[PDB]
């Protein structure tokens, strides 16, 4: 609810 | 009565060319907020945060003088909350929200551009501001 | 009764191996983009963009759905790329754009257009994501 | 003891007029080699290979009699290597290079010529063939 | 045809406005690169902190270098405000930044030049060293010529 991904490449 | 403080903010980033050993870190990048012309934002502005990702060691990075920049490595996009807390401590807070860029576009690299830029204008409005505020933006 | 005017630009940029690859016979590789003419999310308001390559490529008809906007291949020959771009609000038709793509010059080789995506009388929704 | 042989080799390409929509192929083209004189090689010459671009299936086409011509559709241009071999393994193959060629250039357009046609000039030179080969060449 | 230019008030004083602050942000150092026998390539310079043009009310500026230098007073009198040398060692430059109004005092910034790499950026693809500070030109009181040509 209060917290966002983060993401690697490809 | 009515004053406008334009800006711009977001981050630049440059591949290490290589996945780092030691934490797999890939990209330095500094994350930032800026006056939109060459001048002082420090006269009304007391502080402003970097909220990081939660992978960072602490990731709440506050700068409180010139310039507001946040320099970092990583591997990962993640969004950053930036907040900018004014010197008359009643005018309220300012946030903002920045998807930090690392990847590079296949089309800037067949380009050749070195690094990865992403930035946004806004204006911060001062509606209104107590004396000592219509004073601190105005100098 | 008001229309909102989206600067972008198109093409595509492309490099010289130096020689025909031996396993397939290429020559080039390249990348097909659309991106707006200043930085903005176009996310907010597009939904996808499909670029449509020649019947000699596999999966000819490629989506992107997220930015960058962009394709990158290998190839050999010049040819039309259709490139289409959908929209947030179904109610929004999808513009369709033609690029010739080009591997050799009228360093790299780069072919770019401007073009303006144009909303009249945008639905409220719309009006409200190209604002953003 | 010097016997000349003129050959023309290159190609010919007509447009269908729209891409066609199975396989997206613009062009019908035929690539060739013949003798200019009204005259018949297979005497002397072995085969003909004709190697076309990679996209093609078996690239490496090869014609034993005539007409020395291989006939496809495509859509772009690309390089041809043609080897014509001899009767006589004494005499060596000749290699010949050709750019496929399938758009009509500006000027040809504008005189409204209809088809595309990128015609190459050759001699092939026998000196002091071989009786069997000098045999063949007559 | 006929047009005019610009009104401008008469009897306007020009000494100093004494309520006002003016602030601009530069960015000074070098950068420099490994390859007579000299060692490293690199550049010192000065720039505005977001894009401007400062030979508006910027004179000259000048970088004093190592007395084993050559005409060791570098002047620079337009962008791109750099000095560009080749050497083998580091040392402490003296940049001096001179205003359009001769009633201004110059400004003094020092630097110590860095040429070597430390090792975090050894790992990492940089091949230029970059060492690069953030300052404040402050003018307190500006003439109002300094006010003008500051805005």
Redesign the interface.
Known sequence: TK???????A | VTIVKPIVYGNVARYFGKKREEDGHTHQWTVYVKPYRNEDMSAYVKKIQFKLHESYGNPLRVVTKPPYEITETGWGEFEIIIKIFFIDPNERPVTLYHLLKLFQSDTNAMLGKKTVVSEFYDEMIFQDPTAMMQQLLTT
Do not use: L
């Not at chain 1, 917290?3 to 490449?9: D, E, L, N, T, V």
């Open positions: 917290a966002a991904r983060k993401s690697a490449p």
